[PDB]
Amino acid sequence: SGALDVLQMKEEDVLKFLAAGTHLGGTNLDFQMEQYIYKRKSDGIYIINLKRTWEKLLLAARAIVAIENPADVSVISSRNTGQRAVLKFAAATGATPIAGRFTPGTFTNQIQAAFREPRLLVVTDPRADHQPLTEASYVNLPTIALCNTDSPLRYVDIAIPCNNKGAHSVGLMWWMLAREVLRMRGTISREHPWEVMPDLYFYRDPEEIEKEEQAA
Amino acid sequence: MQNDAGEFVDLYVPRKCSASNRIIGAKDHASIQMNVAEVDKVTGRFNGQFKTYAICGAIRRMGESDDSILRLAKADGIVSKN
Amino acid sequence: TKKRRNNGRAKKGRGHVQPIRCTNCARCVPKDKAIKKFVIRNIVEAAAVRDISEASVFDAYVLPKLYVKLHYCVSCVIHSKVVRNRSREARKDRTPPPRFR
Amino acid sequence: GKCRGLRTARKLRSHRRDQKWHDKQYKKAHLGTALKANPFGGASHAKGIVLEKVGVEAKQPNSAIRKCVRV
Amino acid sequence: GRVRTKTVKKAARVIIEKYYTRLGNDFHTNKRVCEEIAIIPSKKLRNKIAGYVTHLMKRIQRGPVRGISIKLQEEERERRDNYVPEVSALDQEIIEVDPDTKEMLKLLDFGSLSNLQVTQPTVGMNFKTPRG
Amino acid sequence: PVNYYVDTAVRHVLLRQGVLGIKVKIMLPWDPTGKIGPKKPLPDHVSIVEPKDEILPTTPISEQK
Amino acid sequence: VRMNVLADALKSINNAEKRGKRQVLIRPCSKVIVRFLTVMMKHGYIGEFEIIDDHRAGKIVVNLTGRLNKCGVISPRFDVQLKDLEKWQNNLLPSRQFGFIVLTTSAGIMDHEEARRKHTGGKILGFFF
Amino acid sequence: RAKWRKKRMRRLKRKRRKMRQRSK
Amino acid sequence: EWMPVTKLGRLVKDMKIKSLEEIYLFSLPIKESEIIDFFLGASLKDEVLKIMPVQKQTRAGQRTRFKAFVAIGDYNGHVGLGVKCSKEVATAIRGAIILAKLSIVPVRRGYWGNKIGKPHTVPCKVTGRCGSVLVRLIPAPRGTGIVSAPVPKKLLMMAGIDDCYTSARGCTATLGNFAKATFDAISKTYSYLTPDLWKETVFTKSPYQEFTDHLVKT
RNA sequence: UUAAAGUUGCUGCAGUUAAAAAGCUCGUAGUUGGAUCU
RNA sequence: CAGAUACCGUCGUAGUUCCGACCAUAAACGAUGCCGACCGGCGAUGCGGCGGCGUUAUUCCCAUGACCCGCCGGGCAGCUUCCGGGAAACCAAAGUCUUUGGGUUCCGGGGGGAGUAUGGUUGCAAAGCUGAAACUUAAAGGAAUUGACGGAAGGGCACCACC
Ligand SMILES: [Mg+2]
Ligand SMILES: [Mg+2]
Ligand SMILES: [Mg+2]
Ligand SMILES: [Mg+2]
Ligand SMILES: [Mg+2]
Ligand SMILES: [Mg+2]
Ligand SMILES: [Mg+2]
Ligand SMILES: [Mg+2]
Ligand SMILES: [Mg+2]
Ligand SMILES: [Mg+2]
Ligand SMILES: [Mg+2]
Ligand SMILES: [Mg+2]
Ligand SMILES: [Mg+2]
Ligand SMILES: [Mg+2]
Ligand SMILES: [Mg+2]
Ligand SMILES: [Mg+2]
Ligand SMILES: [Mg+2]
Ligand SMILES: [Mg+2]
Ligand SMILES: [Mg+2]
Ligand SMILES: [Mg+2]
Ligand SMILES: [Mg+2]
Ligand SMILES: [Mg+2]
Ligand SMILES: [Mg+2]
Ligand SMILES: [Mg+2]
Ligand SMILES: [Mg+2]
Ligand SMILES: [Mg+2]
Ligand SMILES: [Mg+2]
Ligand SMILES: [Mg+2]
Ligand SMILES: [Zn+2]
């Protein structure tokens, strides 16, 4: 944010967080992350500071936008809570996803059919997937991450401080990132609430597939 | 650099890290040149303008590439006070 | 070449430790290095349980258990296979094996 | 480490020369048992008389007789 | 023991990946599909590869297969995935929150939000696991 | 396959020191006979013909000829 | 114990430099440490610094530019003749082009360069580049 | 082995110390 | 014929990158020998420094191979060092030339004294350090040629370092480490921060960010 | 005999496992010694 | 057991024990001198201190103790890390070293000969401290790597192994 009244975070957005609970992180706290913390309540849950979170969102947005070809943004999610979210994001924004298995040697090996040279790297969790991150250390990729109250910031460039654990929290952050880069590029609008519902970016689980298919 | 006559004799003039001021190496592949975009203060849309940073491979391992990106942004007013 | 950082014995910041005689050998070993093993079992074993249970003059008499602390000098263990050697890296893990299912 | 004060001088110099004795070379030259035991007494050459001719077995990995003189 | 060679599974992978529209869940259907689509010697090779093209299709209609990428099943998984309940799960008339969270919002001047409900802090402190 | 796919030759050179026997194994490549390239392919080898590009249909069209 | 505070000061800043830190707290401080830092500062190798005055001995907080590779001290202080100077720098400094030997002299604390000008000798303190 | 040859050395030394006595 | 497989490749073959310095500026990984080759030149020559047999041991006997050390310089701007292992010494050599070509580094040169003419020596004194060899290069007045052992003298000749005072301490016999160290030294000459370089950097559009359109076309 | 020898090392080497830190502490000479005064 | 003046067993002297004198050496080891400065995290633990809801010693007030959540200073350690080193094993010191200097003490200079000869000196003696040389020799050694082997541990197979 530029301190601007336009980009300044509105209430309806806040409520989305508070429901999805992105302001609740783990009991362990990395010293790199202490900057983004607010205070630790009893029951050892650290409370992430939301203005800070917002600003990081916008920052990573500007970083993504700066890039000309939108296919030069790679987006990666190792674990299952990220998969769907990343795909949708990529579709909305026109970036190249990798969900499921990352293959070591994807960035550094020109013989592979997987090979790609992305200008930027967006990543769901630093802890879960080190692999793409360390490759980005051989090829010069700036890097974004969704960082819990505990994450190594090793080789991340610009980190976003949220709960990356629970489905609802991840979904939200992605959808908000998307809503942001899109409101930025000049597509969509700052007035109209986006057609696309955040609920779309969530993680299924098989239990809910069963519930909703056997409700019909 | 310059001989007595004033010519620049050099192959190239290397870029120094924006955070820590070290010289970014000819072959250092952990280096970053990061582009951050500028909005239009009325609209919130994209200008075509951007402010650029560099960070060497040292500071990336230390993880404090992040901290430095951040306070660089504050010094450029791309990040709000607080 | 130094094999273990802790040198096999648990002694830290004290000079010398009271030595104990091995269970199996009688070989002398400092109390820190000694491979220790605690044993709780029942006096009578598997089958004779069900057998003796019938011959009681008491109803619901629960068998006493036998409690013994063993020490095994480094050699004797490896022979008894209470302890077996493991790889350079997997050496480092001091977490006790999973007898808990 | 070494002692680096100013007024340290002699402690340096003194100490050096002791360790200088521990050097096999210099010891040989400046002790003087070396020259005593040397059959030449420090000369390049020596003139001598022939006592007898002597074959001398070569050392192990190769077989020969070396033709020597006892002078 | 009956287990497919590298040849069998690699071949059925590439055959499926290129020709996914032409294959069907019947054995002899895709058997005659592969007598055409690819060039294979003998028989026992042919038959096996086709069997695996089939087997792999019965696994495809279940969902994503690890080995193959088709734009058709990318599109059917673009249908399947896209879903949304009539209302969001992010909409609740009352969302419960801890006093301190309320403080952090009060820094951002949001202490005026209506939907909130302040819930009682938990009195004991034990978040930790009893070491041993 | 090794029968029609490769050619082996064994010989004896006769010299002051003795005889040196020798073996030379040569393998031929595949397909149509140029006096080389035995026609029938390895039972392992699987060749896949790339899909001939097909026009994606737009709206139904009937053409009488 | 602590002797030669100058040494301990410059060790500290040289380390905070390799670490790539922005500021340093060096303590204690001296009317010598201060004039050394000042001579360093005029050429820019360092930046501006601020003396926390405590009723005992100083602390000095130094602002840092990445421009300082090595900062060092030579213990003991040797008496450096004018004629010697050359040898000294040719031993110490990375090049004729840049870097400095700092000495105290009857005139004041300064650079080998400036003393050459003033035609004075003195004692060596340290050097930087 | 070292310990033992240190031993054989002290046996030898002691015997020398006999075979020359200060009466010799 | 050369078919570029990377983003950096296409930009080169399509002449969108004028000189090599646009690469070095952004410290891009150079993954293709033909980049280096197309860029220079007949200007490149190369040495076989050493061919050493290495042996491995199997139940069967010793299975031998070969390590080739090739030093490819362009006299005056650039050197490279490469090391390759193979069963066949020929293969090993041309492989090592590929490897060396892949690693090419620019060599800064400073004046010794009053700056007149073109830079003939090392800017300030540098230390390459490899595995117990410590090579150290020091400024030298014009005309002194290179004072060193034969091995680092090869590299430094090929760099276009005309005059140098070399010190080397360590176990200097072992060739890999001697060469790799002296190479380190002439690497670190563009990482050394002198007062010359103190001007703040004006940045430049990265090749990637600049040509991205013409990239999308191919 | 000098360089090579940074293999006598003030510049300038070493001392966990290669040669090597005293069992341990007290201790006189010896070396070394915090800030502060135009 | 071929032999066993050795491992194994039954005995058993000196010794092992206490007091009183000597002896001064141990893989006396962290195989890492001592004082000092600076340089990443992370949880633990021992001692003192300081703060903090809430439990308990029964029901309310203060002390006090036990647990609990932190903070500070010394400790014994640990995990972790492209801090940096290192020949490497490894070391948050074995780091801040050719970009070489905080103070200081002991001490090494290829392997043997040898911690022997001799003299001096201490002891009651066993020995301790101090300590050469002639000669002799191209290596002796340190880490790691593939092998081969083990009377070392685990898996694995085979009706030319068994059930
Ligand atoms: Mg061993
Ligand atoms: Mg103690
Ligand atoms: Mg002891
Ligand atoms: Mg040398
Ligand atoms: Mg040698
Ligand atoms: Mg000499
Ligand atoms: Mg010299
Ligand atoms: Mg030496
Ligand atoms: Mg030893
Ligand atoms: Mg030793
Ligand atoms: Mg000691
Ligand atoms: Mg005194
Ligand atoms: Mg003073
Ligand atoms: Mg008997
Ligand atoms: Mg007995
Ligand atoms: Mg008895
Ligand atoms: Mg006594
Ligand atoms: Mg001793
Ligand atoms: Mg010792
Ligand atoms: Mg001492
Ligand atoms: Mg306490
Ligand atoms: Mg209290
Ligand atoms: Mg503590
Ligand atoms: Mg030194
Ligand atoms: Mg010797
Ligand atoms: Mg002695
Ligand atoms: Mg005597
Ligand atoms: Mg060994
Ligand atoms: Zn035992």
Author numbering:
A (entry chain A): 2 to 217
B (entry chain V): 1 to 82
C (entry chain a): 2 to 102
D (entry chain X): 2 to 72
E (entry chain R): 2 to 133
F (entry chain D): 163 to 227
G (entry chain W): 2 to 130
H (entry chain h): 2 to 25
Q: What does the article say, verbatim?
A:
Here we present a 3.9 Å cryo-EM structure of the homologous complex of the HCV IRES bound to the human 40S ribosome, which was solved by focused refinement of the HCV IRES bound to 80S ribosomes. Formed in the absence of initiation factors or tRNAs, our complex corresponds to the initial binding complex of IRES to the 40S subunit, in agreement with kinetic data that show that binding occurs in a single step and is followed by 80S assembly. On the basis of structures of individual IRES domains an atomic model could be built for most of the IRES, except for a part of domain IIIb (bases 178–221), for which density is weak, apparently due to partial disorder in the absence of eIF39. The most prominent binding site of the HCV IRES on the 40S subunit is ES7 of the 18S rRNA (bases 1,114–1,118). The apical loop of domain IIId forms a kissing loop interaction with ES7, which becomes ordered on HCV IRES binding in comparison with the structure of the free porcine 40S subunit, where ES7 exhibits considerable flexibility. The highly conserved bases 266GGG268 in the loop of HCV IRES domain IIId form Waston–Crick base pairs with residues 1116CCC1118 within ES7. In this helical region, HCV IRES base A136 is flipped out and forms a Watson–Crick base pair with residue U1115 of ES7, while A296 and G295 from the loop of IRES domain IIIe interact with U1114 of ES7. The binding of domains IIIa and IIIc to eS27 is mainly mediated by the apical loops via two flipped out guanosine residues: G163 in domain IIIa is stacked against the aromatic moiety of Y41, and G233 in domain IIIc forms specific interactions with residues R80, K36 and I43 of eS27. The contacts involve hydrophobic interactions with L18 and I43, while the phosphate backbone of the IRES is complemented through charge–charge interactions with side chains of K16 and R31 and R66. The major binding site is formed by the apical loop of domain II, which reaches into the E-site of the 40S close to the mRNA channel.
HCV virions contain a single-stranded RNA genome and rely on a structured region of its 5′-untranslated region, referred to as the internal ribosome entry site (IRES), for translation of all the encoded proteins. In contrast, the HCV IRES requires only eIF2 and eIF3 for start codon recognition, binding directly to the 40S subunit and eIF3. Translation initiation by the HCV IRES begins with binding of the IRES to the 40S ribosomal subunit. The HCV IRES as well as several HCV-like IRESs share a common conserved fold encompassing around 300 bases, which form two major domains (II and III)6.
